[PDB]
């Protein structure tokens, strides 16, 4: 009952590298729109690729015969722009996408206090706010309404409120007050293997939820998106906004190779990101680094990662498997997904139900009195 509707070659604009590339795309009954570097020989459906509840737009800028699939996924607006040689191909491409999309078919702003602008994007901004009545701290995604339920896990930032105005759509999210993780790692230079095991285990727990329960790739696992709460447990943030890049988008040193090549990607992307995160916690440096992006791309794509002699054998086996450049060969790329990492020797002795229930002791208790303490918001944040 799941079958291809339309397939063929498209010109896809790279999501992080804004260059046009030829990709073979498949439009399926389940609504999945996946592009491949070569024709697929022919895995569970990922929501990242679905065209359900997305809007289609045809345009002649930046280049003619372009169509844009615009989706709201959770609280982030994402775009995928494609280009065919003739307007006829576009029209029959868009209608098929529109066919499958249709075929598969009191809180106000004054209650908060504006504090600090966290980020600007194409379709809105993110702002650190404080709820006046409670004094708690929240991030508010304010999205332009012209352009357009919570599911809780211990280590994901909760979407607390959702409201809209005449022209805005607002998502209020819990903001942890235990400090950014890049701040704690910088102050302590390197984390112990046990400290990184605690942090890694909680991330693996949340990644399993998103992969199996939610059927989505997080695709943005990096140190800057990790925070600690008042107790010292991990919260994976969701404060991202789709920006049109600078003259390329984002910081490429974290990107999985299959994403860097705009190739087909799956749940294995987050395990690469897990490898990058835990490599830096246990080594104190990023695995790949060079100022030239041409070299950095080649580094991430070609140069195999090197380890310091300070790391133990269990750590080196985990990092090597997570940072395998082939996602089919990568630790966590099989059907068992998160189970491959949970069953790894580095996580021996870890009872995984205990991790979900926050039974493991945080090795680092942040110096905060309560959930309203603003120590890591003050100018001691240096
Ligand atoms: C260069 C700058 C730029 O523009 N970069 C860029 C370019 C192209 C992009 N293309 C993209 O996608 N991104 C982003 C889109 C957003 N993610 C992050 C992300 C992924 C899943 C979720 C997410 N999700 C569902 C459930 C869910 C619901 C609906 C759905 O469709 C899928 C899942 C859910 O319950 N909790 C979460 C969640 C909530 C809190 C904390 C953690 C997870 C929340 C956030 C990262 C990749 C792009 C980014």
Q: In what order do the strands lie in the sheet with 112-120?
A: 112-120, 124-131, 137-144, 168-174, 159-164
Is omega for the bond preceding 62 within 30 degrees of 0, making it cis?
yes
Residues 328 and 380 in one domain: yes
Ligand 1 close to Cβ of residue 251 (< 6 A): no
Q: Is 226 in the pocket of ligand 1 (CB under 6 A)?
A: no
Q: Do 80 and 219 sit in the same domain of this protein?
A: no
Q: What resolution does the deposited structure have, in angstroms?
A: 2.6
DSSP 211: I
Q: Is the CB of 216 under 6 A from ligand 1?
A: yes
**Which among 32, 240, 269 is the best mutation to test ligand 1's pocket, defined by most ligand atoms within 8 Å of the CB?**
240
Q: Which domain holds residue 171?
A: 106-179
Residue 335 corresponds to which tokens in the numbers above?
């059907």
Say which CATH number the domain at 157 has. Answer: 3.30.200.20
Where do the DSSP E strands lie in the chain?
4-13, 20-28, 33-36, 54-59, 66-73, 76-83, 112-120, 124-131, 137-144, 159-164, 168-174, 226-228, 234-236
Q: Which residues contact 275 (CB under 8 A, 6 or more apart)?
A: 287, 318, 319, 321, 322, 323
Residue 138 shares a structural domain with residue 21: no
Q: Which of 117, 235, 119 is nearest to 177 (CA)?
A: 235
Give first-to-last CA distance, the chain, whole Å.
57
Ligand 1 pocket, 78 CB below 6 A? yes
| CB distance 16 to ligand 1 below 6 Å | yes
Query: Do 358 and 235 share a structural domain?
Result: yes
Rounded CA-CA distance 132/55 in Å is 36
Q: Is 23 annotated as a binding residue?
A: yes
For residue 68, which of 93, 99, 37 has the smallest C-alpha distance? 93
Last residue of a domain, one of 80, 105, 130: 105
Kindly report the protein residue whose alpha carbon is nearest to atom 20 of ligand 1.
218
Structure tokens that stand for 288 in this block: 């790949």
In the numeric block, which tokens belong to residue 263?
A: 């190739």
Regarding whether 147 and 84 lie in a shared domain, the answer is no
Clarify whether residues 65 and 40 are in a common domain: yes
The CB-based long-range contact list for 189-193 (8 Å cut-off, 24+ gap) reads 189/284, 190/281, 190/282, 190/283, 190/284, 191/281, 191/282, 192/363, 193/282, 193/311, 193/312, 193/314, 193/315
Q: Whose CA is nearest to atom 16 of ligand 1?
A: 76
Residue 220 is a catalytic residue: yes
Question: Is 131 in the same domain as 99?
Answer: no
What is the distance between the alpha carbons of residues 269 and 322, in angstroms, rounded to a whole number?
9
Residue 226 backbone phi and psi in degrees, to 5: -120, 130
Packed helices 268-283 and 313-322: angle between N→C axes, nearest 10 degrees? 140
Closest CA to 314 of 273, 350, 287: 350
Indicate whether 157 and 257 sit together in one domain: no
Residue 47: closest CA among 166, 217, 234, 263? 217
Output the domain CATH number for residue 208: 1.10.510.10
Residue 185 shares a structural domain with residue 174: no
If one residue of 156, 216, 267 were mutated to test the ligand 1 pocket, choosing by the most ligand atoms within 8 A of its CB, it would be 216
- In the three-class reduction of DSSP (H, G, I as helix; E, B as strand; rest coil), residue 358 is classed as coil
Contact (CB, 8 A) for 229 and 237: no
Give Cα separations from 163 to 108, 170, 174, 235 (angstroms).
7, 5, 15, 23
User: For residue 269, what are the CA distances in angstroms to 61, 275, 324?
Assistant: 31, 10, 11
Same domain, 228 and 289: yes
Write the CA distances from 202 to 109, 133, 302, 347, 372, integer angstroms. 34, 32, 30, 11, 23
Experimental method: X-ray
Of the listed 208, 220, 238, 264, which one is catalytic? 220
Q: Are residues 185 and 143 in the same domain?
A: no
* Number of domains the chain contains: 3
CATH label of the domain that carries residue 13 = 2.30.29.30
CA dist 114 and 138 (Å) reads 10
- Residue whose C-alpha is closest to residue 157's, from 73, 74, 70, 71: 74
**Nearest partner of 374 among 151, 166, 177, 158, judged by Cα:** 177
């Amino acid at each position: 009952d799941v079958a291809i509707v339309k397939e063929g070659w498209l010109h896809k604009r790279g999501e992080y590298i804004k260059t046009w590339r030829p990709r073979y795309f498949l439009l399926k009954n389940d609504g999945t729109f996946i592009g491949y570097k070569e024709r697929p020989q022919d895995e569970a459906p990922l929501n990242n690729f679905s065209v359900a509840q997305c809007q289609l737009m045809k345009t002649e800028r930046p280049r003619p015969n372009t169509f844009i699939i615009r989706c709201l996924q959770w609280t982030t607006v994402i775009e995928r722009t494609f280009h065919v040689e003739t307007p006829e191909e576009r029209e029959e491409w868009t209608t098929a996408i529109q066919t499958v999309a249709d075929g598969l078919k009191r809180v106000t702003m004054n209650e908060f206090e504006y504090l600090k602008l966290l980020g600007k994007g194409t379709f809105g901004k993110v702002i650190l706010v404080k709820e006046k009545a409670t004094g708690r701290y929240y991030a508010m995604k304010i999205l332009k309404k012209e352009v357009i339920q919570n599911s809780r896990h211990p280590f994901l930032t909760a979407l607390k409120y959702s409201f809209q105005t005449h022209d805005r759509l607002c998502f209020v999210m819990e903001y942890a007050n235990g400090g950014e993780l890049f701040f704690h790692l910088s102050r302590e230079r390197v984390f112990s293997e046990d400290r990184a095991r605690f942090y890694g285990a909680e991330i693996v727990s949340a990644l399993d939820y998103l992969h199996s329960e939610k059927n989505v790739v997080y695709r943005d696992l990096k140190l800057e998106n990790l925070m600690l709460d008042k107790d010292g447990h991990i919260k994976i943030t969701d404060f991202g906004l789709c920006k049109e890049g600078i003259k390329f988008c984002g910081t490429p040193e974290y990107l999985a190779p299959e994403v860097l090549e705009d190739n087909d990607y799956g749940r294995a992307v987050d395990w690469w990101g897990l490898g990058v995160v835990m490599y830096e916690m246990m080594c104190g440096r990023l695995p790949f680094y060079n100022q030239d992006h041409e070299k950095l791309f080649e580094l991430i794509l070609m140069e195999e990662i090197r380890f310091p002699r300070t790391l133990g054998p269990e750590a080196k086996s985990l990092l090597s498997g997570l940072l395998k450049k082939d996602p089919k060969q990568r630790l966590g790329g099989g059907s068992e997904d998160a189970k491959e990492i949970m069953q790894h020797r580095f996580f021996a002795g870890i009872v995984w139900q205990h991790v979900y229930e926050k039974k493991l002791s945080p090795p680092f208790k942040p110096q905060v009195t309560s959930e309203t303490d603003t120590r890591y918001f003050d100018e001691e944040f240096t």
